[PDB]
Amino acid sequence: ADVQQKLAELERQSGGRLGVALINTADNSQILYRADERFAMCXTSAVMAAAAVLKKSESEPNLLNQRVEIKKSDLVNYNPIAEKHVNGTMSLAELSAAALQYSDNVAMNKLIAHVGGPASVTAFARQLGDETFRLDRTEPTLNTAIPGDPRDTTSPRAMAQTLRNLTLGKALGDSQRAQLVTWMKGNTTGAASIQAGLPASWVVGDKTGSGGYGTTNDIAVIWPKDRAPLILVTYFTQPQPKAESRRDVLASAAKIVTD
Ligand SMILES: [Cl-]
């Protein structure tokens, strides 16, 4: 009850709409706030795209070593890694790492295209038992995050359950699961988000997202010191189209649900 009041207070102070799902694997419990409402995933959908490539690689050895041409025509709105490789190739492993660790738009688009497009990423989610996730569009339009628009959305509950499956469960083979976890632990974009609300000693793998309407998201697997791991989804969106980022709200939510 106290946790619920604190999240409601945070939401009100923020002015926006907050969605939280924590799974605590110590006792199989959950903390949920708007956890069945839909939220625009923005960049956090990259976890599902990378996982789809990893699953495909279980039947195709050396898939991760396959080379992909990078061209000027591939550049999108934010391409911090791919812009260094224009006119050469990157491997699918390198693209996975760039998408997950640097929020690289081109890299996400190459993962999406490789597996067959947004409907194929969505069909993979369905195969895993996630009947809520939908990836409708490619980068950059998947981040528009217009209120009331169901495109490119999921719920906090569904994404927490799916992230648990991907990182701690058996969706992927052992090599592929370990690779996903290693990639997420190496993320560079999340230090102001969930990580900022947790003790410094805890280990985090996370993927952020951002978009229109000040949408600010993070999904994480967390290893607290000497505790069973947690899964935490924090999604946040705001009423104004040009609202500024609010990573501090995600940090605050993480602190509230883990204190
Ligand atoms: Cl600390």
Numbering used by the authors: 28 to 286
The study reports:
CTX-M-15 (cefotaximase-Munich-15) is a class A extended-spectrum β-lactamase (ESBL) capable of hydrolyzing penicillins and cephalosporins, including third- and fourth-generation cephalosporins such as ceftazidime and cefepime, respectively. It is predominantly plasmid mediated, disseminated worldwide, and encountered in diverse Gram-negative pathogens, mostly Enterobacterales, but occasionally also in nonfermenters. CTX-M-15, like other class A SBLs, employs an acylation-deacylation mechanism to hydrolyze β-lactam antibiotics, utilizing four invariant residues: Ser70, Lys73, Ser130, and Glu166. In this study, ultrahigh-resolution X-ray crystal structures and mass spectrometry revealed the mechanism of PAS inhibition of CTX-M-15, an extended-spectrum β-lactamase (ESBL) globally disseminated among Enterobacterales.
A cocrystal structure of enmetazobactam with CTX-M-15 with a Lys73Ala mutation indicates that epimerization can occur without cross-link formation and positions the Ser70 Cβ closer to Lys73, likely facilitating formation of the Ser70-Lys73 cross-link. Ser70 epimerization can occur without cross-link formation. To clarify whether Ser70 epimerization results from cross-link formation, we obtained X-ray diffraction data (0.95-Å resolution) from 3-day-old cocrystals of enmetazobactam with a CTX-M-15 Lys73Ala mutant (CTX-M-15K73A). These data reveal l-Ser70 to have undergone epimerization to d-Ser70. Comparison with the uncomplexed CTX-M-15K73A structure (which at a 0.95-Å resolution clearly contains l-Ser70) shows that this is due to enmetazobactam exposure rather than mutation of Lys73 to Ala. Epimerization leads to the d-Ser70 side chain oxygen interacting with Glu166 and Asn170, which causes loss of the catalytic water molecule.
